[PDB]
Design a protein around this ligand. Structure first.
Ligand SMILES: [Mg+2]
Ligand SMILES: [Mg+2]
Ligand SMILES: [Mg+2]
Ligand SMILES: [Mg+2]
Ligand SMILES: [Mg+2]
Ligand SMILES: [Mg+2]
Ligand SMILES: [Mg+2]
Ligand SMILES: [Mg+2]
Ligand SMILES: [Mg+2]
Ligand SMILES: [Mg+2]
Ligand SMILES: [Mg+2]
Lengths: 109, 139, 201, 125, 100, 51
RNA sequence: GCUGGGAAGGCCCGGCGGGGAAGGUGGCUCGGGGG
RNA sequence: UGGGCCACUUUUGGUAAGCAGAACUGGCGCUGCGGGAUGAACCGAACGCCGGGUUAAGGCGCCCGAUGCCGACGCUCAUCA
RNA sequence: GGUUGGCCUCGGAUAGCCGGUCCCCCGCCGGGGUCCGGUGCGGAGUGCCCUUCGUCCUGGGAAACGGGGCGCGGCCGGAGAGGCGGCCGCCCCCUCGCCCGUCACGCACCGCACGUUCGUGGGGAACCUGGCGCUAAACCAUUCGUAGACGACCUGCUUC
């Protein structure tokens, strides 16, 4: 009946210039462009939802081609509204520039 | 072309910084970048303030430069800057932004319903006016 | 965002607009830049023309047909500037470069759309008013671009239709205000709700 | 929202006649508390509305061990007549207070959603 | 937009074939039928009007007459010859008169 | 080191590549610039080199 | 908590005063204006 | 092992040298890592396999992590900046 | 495999802008000059539009010169990449859909994820069901010699 999640972009991995720590990812939440605004989203569950070829079991539904890698926002990155996120498996590099959903689930408001 | 000038007595609106949202009076001018400023009736004690954070209003008070805060306050209250400011379209635009930002979820719902009905009646009258304007027949 | 971001190149600085655009297309956004002949470059026209002529001199001595390709249209000049800010030799950079479309003038898909503006790249705010600048359209025309005249005529014809559309828009807005005065007794109930909550002062 | 239960789960009923939510449990970590409230003092929540009351009841394979004949019977959860009684008992004194404040029932009928321009960190709930 | 005339000669039609010997010579047989029916005639009039309104330069497709030459080749040579000197309306009327 | 005596280059680089023409007819590639003042006329023709 | 037992500052038309001026108020003079 | 080489500083021959020869300490050789785009020696720091936090030197338009600060004050127009 | 409402458009200035309005000129609309407003842009992209629980009794308002047809037919505009819009005529439906209320009901699946859209998505083979339509070339082989290392290229081959 409605979107119920914030739109985020998988910008890349936490990195130096020549080293890459793939275990954590940097996300760009839409409409969040200052560090002081990221406090709302800390600890919120985030999901990388993608499609594949083979059907997989869906909780509370028929099997379909939707898969998900779960995660959560850990802290703020930089001054411009970036956030860091840890997913249960490191995000694939093909998702860079694609959609991550920030779920509002563990709310504190 | 210019209508508002930095001058002694000119009332300015602080747009950002520690005193954002408040009115002040320019008491003196220093070094082209700052000004001795003072809001005695708006809770801004006398202090330096850059011109970059000021937005000049249309009010000008009458007091000599670097007069004491007492005389700045007397001019402010005699001119009733607080009431005159609140009656401007500038202040009412500021107030509307504030009460829109603090709108709750229920208030957003009621605004959605009121605007839904308001737009439907207006655009119905617009279509009615369009047909009346289209009913022209004269060579 | 998810939609196509259409930008008007007029009054924008070449490298400041290109830096914003390059970051946007790396973040998975489709970006269209129109009217690339209105883009400005800081510095007087002569020293910017010298910069392009030095670019023209760079060519492969052995086989210039292999060497650097010097694109003369302002849209292709801007496109090459964005490519200089992208990692175009990787698959990620090539995908980002494919999300960018550049045009001279405003072609029919986008001449009927609203066009955004990037203030952090506008000449009016980024450049001191006493400094000099060059037009990308004039610079391109004098290094080989052949379509300055035809794009000028097509832009004038487009602006005539846009003026007609704007006059109808004003007429509809005037009729909107007249209607809003007519239905006033039955609108003030919902108007006061809007005024209370900060919409419609 | 009505009360917190002994397990910390919230007991809620957005009245069943408004949005089809019965007397139900929910976790406070997974709800958003808005700033709009109805005075539900001097209402009487029945005493037996506890965690044991709301805990799921099910029973599979007591005497069945090897699965060759399907145990797909009883699967449909059935609303108890007692649950219908408690639903009417609470709704009979929650609804008259919802109707008291204008267009609150319509607010409870609608669902919450995110529009492409609105952002939760900027919203006041 | 390109508009071809009715009654295109055989030597011109050979240009459209790599093997005129084996072909059924079907080139432009359905196009020439729109010079006679009413719907096709209206479409041709629209194409000429659109050329008047939106085109800046027009050309005529002309072919040589192989049969008058002493050469072995019978396949004619087609080329576009630009029409200069006037308005687009004037050069379209001039070219329309010269068809066939 | 420099070549001992100057000599002009053999051939013209303006006619490269020296490949077989992709066409047999020979195409115009540039018609005379059109002016509306003149009467309507044709700008080209096709002939055959008899001898 | 300390400090110059902070420095400034606010209110008490601060009151009896004294002195100094200028980025000179009023007035006065001159030169330009609005009924 | 008994071919060394480099840097700050002192220092001899030489016009000088990425030259030749000394003193002192450190390094490279034997050494990976962050930075200097790149680089035996410079700057930071030395290393078991990892998670979290924080830094150094260095940076924070885009490539490319980080200023998308309503940063402060000036200086500067270059037709080889 | 992505995605999870739309914005259908003045030109522009920046030591200035925007809107509205009476007189003059240009074939009943635009351009000027007065005059009146607004300008930290409120005729505001910090904006606007749409807004999804569904139905049943049931009142009041909005409307009622209204709303919906992958229903027909005609016309108009758009060429810069028109791939898009708009206006009529006929026919059939409901007086419903929009706001505030009355009234109860729907699996209320017993706290839990990938839910919610674009979407009747793109692509490729195959099957059935109806209607309207079409019956061709390219290459080799042969020939030419305006061509040529070989490929390639220029040509001819039951009609007047
Ligand atoms: Mg010489
Ligand atoms: Mg040495
Ligand atoms: Mg060794
Ligand atoms: Mg050692
Ligand atoms: Mg080391
Ligand atoms: Mg390194
Ligand atoms: Mg270097
Ligand atoms: Mg670590
Ligand atoms: Mg760097
Ligand atoms: Mg970055
Ligand atoms: Mg120099």
């Amino acid at each position: 009946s409605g979107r119920l999640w914030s739109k985020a972009i998988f910008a890349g991995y936490k990195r130096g210039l020549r080293n890459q720590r793939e275990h954590t990812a940097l996300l760009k939440i839409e409409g969040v462009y200052a560090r002081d605004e990221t406090e709302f989203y800390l600890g919120k569950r985030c999901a990388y939802v993608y499609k594949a070829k083979n059907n997989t079991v869906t909780p509370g539904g028929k099997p379909n081609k939707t898969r998900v890698i779960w995660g959560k926002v850990t802290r703020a990155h930089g001054n411009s509204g970036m956030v860091r996120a840890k997913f249960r498996s490191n995000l694939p590099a093909k998702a860079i520039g694609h959609r991550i959903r920030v779920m509002l689930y563990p709310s504190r408001i | 072309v210019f209508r508002r000038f930095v001058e002694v007595g000119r009332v300015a609106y602080v747009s950002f910084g520690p005193h954002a949202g408040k009115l002040v009076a320019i008491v003196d001018v220093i070094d082209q970048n700052r000004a001795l400023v003072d809001g005695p009736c708006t809770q801004v004690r006398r202090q330096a303030m850059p011109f970059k954070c000021m937005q000049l209003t249309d009010f000008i008070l009458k007091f000599p430069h670097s007069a004491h805060q007492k005389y700045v306050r007397q001019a402010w209250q005699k001119a009733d800057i607080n009431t005159k400011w609140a009656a401007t379209r500038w202040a009412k635009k500021i107030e509307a932004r504030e009460r829109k930002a603090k709108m709750t979820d229920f208030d957003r719902f009621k605004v959605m319903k009121a605007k839904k009905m308001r737009n439907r009646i207006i655009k119905n009258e617009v279509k009615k006016l369009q047909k009346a304007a289209l009913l022209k027949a004269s060579p | 965002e998810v939609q196509v971001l259409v930008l008007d190149g007029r009054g924008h600085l070449l490298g400041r607009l290109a830096a914003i655009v390059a970051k946007q297309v790396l973040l998975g956004r489709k970006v269209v830049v129109v009217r690339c002949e209105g883009i400005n470059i800081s510095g007087n026209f002569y020293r910017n023309k010298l910069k392009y002529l030095a670019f023209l001199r760079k060519r492969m001595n052995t086989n210039p047909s292999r060497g650097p390709y010097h694109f003369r249209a302002p849209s292709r000049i801007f496109w090459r500037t964005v490519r200089g800010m992208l990692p175009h030799k990787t698959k990620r950079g090539q995908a980002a470069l494919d999300r960018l479309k550049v045009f001279d003038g405003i072609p029919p898909p986008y001449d009927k759309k609203k066009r955004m503006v990037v203030p952090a790249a506008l000449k009016v705010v980024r450049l001191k008013p006493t400094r000099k600048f060059a037009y990308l359209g004039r610079l391109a025309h004098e290094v080989g671009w052949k379509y300055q005249a035809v794009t000028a005529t097509l832009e004038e014809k487009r602006k005539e239709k846009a003026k007609i559309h704007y006059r109808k828009k004003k007429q509809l807005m005037r009729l909107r205000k007249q209607a809003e005065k007519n239905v006033e007794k039955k609108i003030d109930k919902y108007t006061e709700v809007l005024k209370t909550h900060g919409l419609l002062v | 929202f009505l009360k917190q239960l002994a397990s910390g789960l919230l007991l809620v009923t957005g009245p069943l006649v408004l949005n089809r939510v019965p007397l139900r449990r929910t976790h406070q970590k997974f709800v958003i508390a808005t700033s709009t409230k109805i005075d539900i003092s001097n209402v009487k929540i029945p005493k037996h509305l506890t965690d044991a009351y709301f805990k799921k009841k099910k029973l599979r394979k007591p005497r069945h061990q090897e699965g060759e004949i399907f145990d797909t019977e009883k699967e449909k959860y059935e609303i108890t007549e007692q649950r219908k009684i408690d639903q009417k008992a609470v709704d009979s004194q929650i609804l008259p207070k919802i109707k008291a404040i204008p267009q609150l029932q319509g607010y409870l009928r609608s669902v919450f959603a995110l529009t492409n321009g609105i952002y939760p960190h900027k919203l006041v709930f | 937009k390109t508009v071809f005339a009715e009654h295109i000669s055989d030597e011109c039609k050979r240009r459209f074939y790599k093997n005129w010997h084996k072909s059924k010579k079907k080139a432009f047989t359905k196009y020439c039928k729109k010079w006679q029916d009413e719907d096709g005639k209206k479409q041709l009039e629209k194409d000429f009007s659109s050329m008047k309104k939106y085109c800046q330069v027009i050309r005529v497709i002309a072919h040589t007459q192989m049969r008058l030459l002493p050469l072995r080749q019978k396949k004619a040579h087609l080329m576009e010859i630009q029409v200069n000197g006037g308005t687009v309306a004037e050069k379209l009327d001039w070219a329309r008169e010269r068809l066939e | 080191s420099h070549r001992k005596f100057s000599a002009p280059r053999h051939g013209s680089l303006g006619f490269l590549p020296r490949k077989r023409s992709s066409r047999h007819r020979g195409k115009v590639k540039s018609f005379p610039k059109d002016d509306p003042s003149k009467p309507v006329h044709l700008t080209a023709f096709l002939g055959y080199k008899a001898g």
